[PDB]
Write an enzyme that holds these catalytic residues in place. Structure first.
Site, short mmCIF file in Angstrom:
data_model
loop_
_atom_site.label_atom_id
_atom_site.label_comp_id
_atom_site.label_asym_id
_atom_site.label_seq_id
_atom_site.Cartn_x
_atom_site.Cartn_y
_atom_site.Cartn_z
N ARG A 94 3.69 3.17 -37.66
CA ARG A 94 2.89 4.20 -36.88
C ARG A 94 3.70 5.04 -36.73
O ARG A 94 3.76 6.07 -35.65
CB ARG A 94 2.38 3.31 -35.89
CG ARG A 94 1.04 2.72 -36.12
CD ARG A 94 1.09 1.76 -34.78
NE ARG A 94 1.48 0.85 -34.72
CZ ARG A 94 0.99 -0.02 -33.52
NH1 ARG A 94 1.20 0.18 -32.62
NH2 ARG A 94 2.38 -0.83 -33.82
N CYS A 106 0.27 -1.81 -37.30
CA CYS A 106 0.25 -1.53 -38.44
C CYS A 106 2.35 -0.86 -37.87
O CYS A 106 3.05 -0.44 -36.91
CB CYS A 106 -0.38 -0.20 -38.04
SG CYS A 106 0.41 1.05 -39.67
N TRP A 123 1.00 5.55 -47.64
CA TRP A 123 1.76 4.78 -47.97
C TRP A 123 2.59 2.84 -48.82
O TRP A 123 2.67 2.32 -47.36
CB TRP A 123 3.31 5.32 -49.01
CG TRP A 123 4.03 5.31 -48.17
CD1 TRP A 123 5.19 4.72 -47.59
CD2 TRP A 123 4.07 7.01 -46.85
NE1 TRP A 123 5.28 5.46 -46.48
CE2 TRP A 123 4.70 6.49 -45.99
CE3 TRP A 123 2.66 7.47 -47.02
CZ2 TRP A 123 5.11 7.56 -45.25
CZ3 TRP A 123 3.47 8.81 -46.32
CH2 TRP A 123 4.12 8.77 -44.72
N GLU A 179 3.88 -5.50 -48.90
CA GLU A 179 3.31 -5.47 -49.61
C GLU A 179 2.53 -6.23 -50.58
O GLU A 179 1.26 -7.12 -51.04
CB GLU A 179 2.23 -4.50 -49.09
CG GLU A 179 2.96 -3.99 -47.47
CD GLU A 179 0.86 -2.90 -47.08
OE1 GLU A 179 0.65 -3.46 -47.07
OE2 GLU A 179 1.82 -1.93 -47.45
C1 HEM Z 1 1.27 5.70 -43.89
C2 HEM Z 1 2.59 4.41 -44.25
C3 HEM Z 1 1.68 3.13 -43.88
C4 HEM Z 1 2.76 2.27 -43.27
C5 HEM Z 1 4.30 1.58 -44.80
C6 HEM Z 1 1.64 0.62 -43.17
C7 HEM Z 1 2.01 -0.32 -43.68
C8 HEM Z 1 1.46 -0.81 -43.15
C9 HEM Z 1 1.11 -3.01 -43.28
C10 HEM Z 1 2.47 -3.01 -43.91
C11 HEM Z 1 0.38 -3.26 -42.43
C12 HEM Z 1 -0.24 -4.61 -43.01
C13 HEM Z 1 -0.96 -5.16 -44.32
C14 HEM Z 1 -0.14 -6.39 -44.30
O1 HEM Z 1 0.42 -6.63 -44.43
O2 HEM Z 1 -1.60 -6.72 -45.06
C15 HEM Z 1 -0.14 -2.40 -42.19
C16 HEM Z 1 -1.52 -2.96 -40.85
C17 HEM Z 1 -2.30 -1.67 -40.88
N1 HEM Z 1 -2.40 -0.17 -40.76
FE1 HEM Z 1 -0.87 1.07 -41.64
N2 HEM Z 1 0.48 1.63 -43.16
C18 HEM Z 1 0.48 3.00 -43.31
C19 HEM Z 1 -0.57 4.43 -43.22
C20 HEM Z 1 -1.03 3.42 -41.87
C21 HEM Z 1 -2.61 4.82 -41.30
C22 HEM Z 1 -2.13 5.95 -42.56
C23 HEM Z 1 -3.27 4.30 -40.84
C24 HEM Z 1 -4.55 4.78 -40.20
C25 HEM Z 1 -4.89 6.52 -40.17
C26 HEM Z 1 -2.88 3.24 -40.75
C27 HEM Z 1 -2.83 2.01 -39.88
C28 HEM Z 1 -3.30 0.54 -40.08
C29 HEM Z 1 -4.37 -0.67 -39.46
C30 HEM Z 1 -5.93 -0.26 -39.46
C31 HEM Z 1 -4.11 -2.15 -39.63
C32 HEM Z 1 -3.77 -3.19 -39.63
C33 HEM Z 1 -5.38 -3.56 -41.25
C34 HEM Z 1 -5.68 -5.45 -39.81
O3 HEM Z 1 -6.10 -5.14 -38.75
O4 HEM Z 1 -6.04 -5.85 -40.92
N3 HEM Z 1 -2.03 2.15 -41.79
N4 HEM Z 1 0.35 -1.00 -42.31
C1 LIG Z 2 -5.05 -9.67 -44.34
C2 LIG Z 2 -6.20 -8.96 -45.17
O1 LIG Z 2 -6.46 -7.91 -44.58
C3 LIG Z 2 -5.32 -6.10 -44.45
C4 LIG Z 2 -4.57 -6.47 -45.27
C5 LIG Z 2 -4.07 -5.43 -45.15
C6 LIG Z 2 -4.12 -3.95 -44.50
C7 LIG Z 2 -3.76 -2.61 -44.43
C8 LIG Z 2 -4.12 -1.77 -43.87
C9 LIG Z 2 -3.84 -0.23 -44.41
C10 LIG Z 2 -2.44 0.09 -45.37
C11 LIG Z 2 -2.47 0.78 -44.88
C12 LIG Z 2 -3.25 2.11 -44.27
C13 LIG Z 2 -1.08 1.37 -45.75
C14 LIG Z 2 -0.50 0.08 -45.99
N1 LIG Z 2 0.82 0.76 -46.61
N2 LIG Z 2 -0.77 -1.19 -46.53
C15 LIG Z 2 -2.16 -1.37 -45.39
C16 LIG Z 2 -2.90 -2.30 -45.49
C17 LIG Z 2 -5.73 -4.05 -44.27
C18 LIG Z 2 -5.88 -5.34 -44.08
C19 LIG Z 2 -7.92 -4.93 -43.22
N3 LIG Z 2 -8.67 -5.36 -44.38
#
Ligand code: HEM
Ligand SMILES: CCOc1ccc(-c2ccc3c(C)cc(N)nc3c2)cc1CN
Ligand code: HEM
Ligand SMILES: CCOc1ccc(-c2ccc3c(C)cc(N)nc3c2)cc1CN
Ligand SMILES: C[C@H](O)[C@H](O)[C@H]1CNc2nc(N)[nH]c(=O)c2N1
Ligand SMILES: C[C@H](O)[C@H](O)[C@H]1CNc2nc(N)[nH]c(=O)c2N1
Ligand SMILES: [Zn+2]
Lengths: 414, 408
Positions: free
Chosen positions: A115, A112, A284, A289
Site C-alpha cells: 500500500r 495489503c 506487481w 506469492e
Molecule cells: C503494486 C504492488 C502490490 C503489491 C506488492 C501487493 C502485495 C500484496 C500481497 C502480497 C497481498 C497478499 C496476497 C496473498 O498472500 O495471498 C496483497 C493483498 C491485497 N491487495 Fe495488494 N499488492 C499490490 C497492489 C495492490 C493494488 C493495486 C490493490 C488495489 C487497488 C491491492 C489490493 C489488495 C487487496 C484488496 C488485498 C487482499 C486480498 C484478499 O483479501 O484476499 N493491492 N497485496
Molecule cells: C488466499 C487467496 O485469496 C487471495 C490471495 C491473494 C490476493 C491478492 C490480491 C491482489 C494482489 C495484488 C493487487 C498484487 C499482488 N502482488 N498480489 C495480490 C494478491 C487476493 C485474494 C482474494 N481472492
C-alpha cells in the site's frame, strides 16, 4: 472503545498512537471474548434509507480530503445525491469521487503489504459498458497498460455498479490471468489445482483446452445480469517469465514459468454504499506469492520434493530442513528470473521494510493504518522481516474491497 | 453459537463449543482486532472465582454435585470468610497447573500438557529455600538430556507486599553487557537484568555466554543472589553437519528452557513465582535467539563464511544463512542426545492436538500469530489452520517486572 490506542514495535521500541480506528465501520468477527484474526472469511439490495447516511458519510469524507468541507459545493453535492437517491433509489458518483474511492479502498485494504503505492493507481472508468464484448475490450486495454513491457503499473477497471442485483456485471475469473488445472481420472492434477473448478466451468461453456501445465485461462465475462461469455486473451498481451536459477543449471529443466501480472478480478468494490461487483485490479508480485505459495503449497504446484531431489538433499529426516533449503532456492530462482527479464517484482525484505515506513507515515498523517498481521507477514522468513515485530490494529474502513460469492453459485441462468 | 474452523490445506472442519465457557477478555472488540498486540481481589470477588474453579475440577473427575463437591465449597467459603483467602488441595494444585498449560493459547507444545511434573513449594519461606527448590527442579527437568516437563509453585500472593518472585525471566540465561564503544557483549535482551545483578554484587566473567545468577525474592523481601551449580547447567556447542568452520563461530546454548517471570492464576489465587520448563523447538534458538536484530544477531557473520552475495537483499542471503543456522542447532542437540524438536514435527503434533481437543473438549484456544513458526511458515501445517482464540482459566498471565514495583 477509548479515543486513543497505542501500538509498539518490539524491535525498535517505536510507539504509534491510533485515532483513525474511531472511523471504523463494519464488524470484524471479534468480540470482547473471542478473536477471529486467523479466520479467512468471517461473516438483494439496499434500501433508500440505508443509503442516505452511507452516501453522506463518503461525500463528507471526500470534500474533507480536498479541503472544501462544508463548502457551497459540498452542500450542493449533498443536495444532488439526496434527491437522486429519493427519486431513483440509487445515485451516480462523479469521476473525481470514483477515483478518490478506488484509491482509498486500496489504502484501507488491511491485508495489503503493497500500500505504499496506493496513491499511484490508474483508474479506468468503465461505467458505460453494456455488453461482455465491451468488458473484454476494457480488460485487454487494462492488461496492456498495466504490463507496459515489464515496467508494471498499478491499475483498476471499474464496471457498472449493482442496481437491483439481477443485472450484475461480474468477472467469473478469480484473476484476469491464471493457469488452468485439469483433474485427471487417476486422481492426479495437471496444471494449477487451485483453478480446477473454474477450468471445468470454462470447458462446459465451450472452451477447448490444450491440456498442458501452463495454459492461460479464457476470460469468462458477465454483463448486466446476462449469462457469461468466453473470450481468449490475445497471447501477446500475457507477459510470462521462465524460471531459472543463478547457480543451478538444471533448474531450467523443471520447465517452470509464471505470468508477470497479478490481477485479482473476483472482489467487490464498495464506495459510499454503491456496489461495484466487477472491478479487476492489478499491481506487481511479491516474490513469495509465486515462490512460496503458488509453487510450494501442497495443494498448488507443489514442487518442493522434485527440487529437493535435484539438490540431492537428505529427505528422510524432516530435521534436515530439506524443505526449508529447497524453498529458499526456489524463491531465489523466481526473483532472479523476473529481475533478469526486467519485469517488476519485489522481494519480501524490501516490501516489508517499505510497508513499515508506509505505516508510520499513515499514523502521522492519517491517525492510523489498519493492518492484518496474519496476512502482512510473509509466508517464509517471518521474524527476519520487520513486520513480524510490529504490533498492528485491524479494523474495517470504507471505501473498501470485499469478498463476494462465486457467481456460478448465484447466477440465475437465462 | 457454535463456531467452525477450517484447515484450508486438508479442508477438515472442526466445531468449537468450548469458547462459550470462556470468561476472560481477549483484547478485541466488535470493531477492532488486537490479535497481534503482545500485552492487550477481596473476599467479595474471590469466592465466585473459587467456586468456578472447584466446580470445573469436580466436573473433571465426574463427581459434580457429589457430597465431596458440596463439602469442598463450604470449606472454601468458610476459609475465605475467616482468612480472606483459601488454600488449594494438592490434587487441585496439580489439576490447576496442567490446565493452565492446556489453556495456553500461545503454546505449540500442548500435546504434552497432562505429562507435567508439579513441584509444590508452597511451604517455602526464604530466598535460600527458593534456591533449593529451583536446583531440584533444574536437576529433575534436565535428566541428563532426556528433558522432562516440570513446574515449581511457590506461595500465592497475599496482601501484595509479601510476593515471591523469580527476578530472572528464565532460570538459565546468558548475560549481556554494555560495551564502552556502544556495542553489546552477549545477549542484549538481558543487559538490564545483568546490570541489576552486578549492582547487587555479582562478579561478571564478561564473556559472551555467561550463565546468569539466580535473583530470588521471598515474601516481599529484597532479592538475593545464588550461583546455580555449574554441573546442573546442560549446554550444547553448536556445530554444522557440512560446514566444518561453523564450530569456529564458538556458539553454544543451554538445553533447558525455563520461563520464570510469569504468573499462574488458579481459582482466583495468584502464584507470582512459578518457573516452568519443557524442551526447545529449534527455531526459538536458531531464528529468534541467534538472528533477531536485538539479539545475538549472527546472520551477517554466518553469511560471510558462506561467502554469499550480501549486496542485494534479493539474493535472499539472509534466508539461506538462516536455514543453515537452524540446521546446525538441530544437528548439535541431536548429536548430544539433548531433547529438541523441529518446527515441522512440532506443528504437525499441534494439529493432531487440536484434533484431540476438539473431540474430547469441544475446542482448543490457539493464537495463530504465536503458533506459526518464525520461518518457513506456510510449509508447516499450522499456517493453513484456522484458529479461534479465547481466554480460559486456570491461565498463565504476564506480570510487571519486579524492579518497577519493589521498594528496597
Ligand atoms: C503494486 C504492488 C502490490 C503489491 C506488492 C501487493 C502485495 C500484496 C500481497 C502480497 C497481498 C497478499 C496476497 C496473498 O498472500 O495471498 C496483497 C493483498 C491485497 N491487495 Fe495488494 N499488492 C499490490 C497492489 C495492490 C493494488 C493495486 C490493490 C488495489 C487497488 C491491492 C489490493 C489488495 C487487496 C484488496 C488485498 C487482499 C486480498 C484478499 O483479501 O484476499 N493491492 N497485496
Ligand atoms: C488466499 C487467496 O485469496 C487471495 C490471495 C491473494 C490476493 C491478492 C490480491 C491482489 C494482489 C495484488 C493487487 C498484487 C499482488 N502482488 N498480489 C495480490 C494478491 C487476493 C485474494 C482474494 N481472492
Ligand atoms: C514440552 C515442550 C514445549 C514446547 C516445545 C513448547 C513450545 C513453545 C513455543 C515454541 C512457544 C513460543 C515461544 C516463543 O516463540 O517465544 C511457547 C510458549 C509458551 N509456552 Fe510452551 N512449550 C513446551 C512446554 C511448555 C510447558 C511445560 C509450559 C507450562 C507449564 C508451557 C507454557 C507456555 C506458555 C504460557 C507460552 C506463552 C508465552 C507467553 O505468552 O509469553 N510450555 N511454547
Ligand atoms: C516476549 C516473549 O515472551 C515469551 C515468549 C516465549 C515464552 C516461552 C515460555 C515457555 C516455553 C517453554 C515452557 C518451552 C519452550 N520451548 N519455549 C517456551 C517459551 C515465554 C515468554 C514470556 N516471557
Ligand atoms: C488460516 C490462515 O488464516 C490462512 O492460511 C492465511 C494465513 N495468512 C495468509 N497471508 C497471506 N498473505 N495470504 C494468505 O493466503 C494467507 N492465508
Ligand atoms: C508483534 C507480534 O505480536 C510479536 O512480535 C509476536 C509475534 N509472534 C510471536 N510468536 C512467538 N511464537 N513468539 C513471539 O515472541 C512472537 N512475537
Ligand atoms: Zn481479534
Amino acid at each position: 472503545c477509548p479515543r486513543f490506542l497505542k501500538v509498539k514495535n518490539w524491535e525498535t521500541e517505536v510507539v504509534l498512537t491510533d485515532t483513525l480506528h474511531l472511523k471504523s465501520t463494519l464488524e470484524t468477527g471479534c468480540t470482547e471474548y473471542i478473536c477471529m484474526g486467523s479466520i479467512m472469511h468471517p461473516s438483494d439490495v439496499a434500501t433508500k434509507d440505508q443509503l442516505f447516511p452511507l452516501a453522506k458519510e463518503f461525500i463528507d469524507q471526500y470534500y474533507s480530503s480536498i479541503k472544501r468541507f462544508g463548502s457551497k459545493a459540498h452542500m450542493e453535492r449533498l443536495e444532488e445525491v439526496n434527491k437522486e437517491i429519493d427519486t431513483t433509489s440509487t445515485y451516480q458518483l462523479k469521476d473525481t469521487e470514483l477515483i478518490y474511492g478506488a484509491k482509498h479502498a486500496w489504502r484501507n485494504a488491511s491485508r495489503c503489504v503493497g500500500r505504499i503505492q496506493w496513491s499511484k493507481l490508474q483508474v479506468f472508468d468503465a461505467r458505460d459498458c453494456t455488453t461482455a464484448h465491451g468488458m473484454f475490450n476494457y480488460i485487454c486495454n487494462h492488461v496492456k497498460y498495466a504490463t507496459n513491457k515489464g515496467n508494471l503499473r498499478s491499475a483498476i477497471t471499474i464496471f457498472p455498479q449493482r442496481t437491483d442485483g439481477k443485472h450484475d456485471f461480474r468477472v467469473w475469473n478469480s484473476q484476469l490471468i491464471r493457469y488452468a488445472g485439469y483433474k485427471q481420472p487417476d486422481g492426479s492434477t495437471l496444471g494449477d489445482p487451485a483453478n480446477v473448478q473454474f477450468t471445468e466451468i470454462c470447458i462446459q461453456q465451450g472452451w477447448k483446452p490444450p491440456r498442458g501445465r501452463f495454459d492461460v485461462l479464457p476470460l469468462l465475462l458477465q454483463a448486466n445480469g446476462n449469462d457469461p461469455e468466453l473470450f481468449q486473451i490475445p497471447p501477446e498481451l500475457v507477459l510470462e517469465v521462465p524460471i531459472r536459477h543463478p547457480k543451478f543449471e538444471w533448474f531450467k529443466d523443471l520447465g517452470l514459468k509464471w505470468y508477470g501480472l497479478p490481477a485479482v478480478s473476483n472482489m467487490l468494490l464498495e464506495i459510499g454504499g454503491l456496489e461495484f461487483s466487477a472491478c479487476p485490479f492489478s499491481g506487481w508480485y511479491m516474490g513469495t506469492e509465486i515462490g512460496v505459495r503458488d509453487y510450494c503449497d501442497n495443494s498448488r504446484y507443489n514442487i518442493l520434493e522434485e527440487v529437493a531431489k535435484k539438490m540431492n538433499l537428505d529427505m528422510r529426516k524432516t530435521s534436515s530442513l530439506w524443505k526449508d533449503q529447497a524453498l529458499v532456492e526456489i524463491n531465489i530462482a523466481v526473483l532472479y528470473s523476473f529481475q533478469s527479464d526486467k519485469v517488476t517484482i519485489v522481494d519480501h525484505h524490501s516490501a516489508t521494510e517499505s510497508f513499515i515506513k508506509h505505516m508510520e507515515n499513515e499514523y502521522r498523517c492519517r491517525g492510523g493504518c489498519p493492518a492484518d498481521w496474519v496476512w502482512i507477514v510473509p509466508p517464509m522468513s517471518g521474524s527476519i522481516t520487520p513486520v513480524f515485530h510490529q504490533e498492528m490494529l485491524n479494523y474495517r474502513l470504507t471505501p473498501s474491497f470485499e469478498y463476494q460469492p462465486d457467481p456460478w453459485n448465484t447466477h440465475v441462468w437465462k
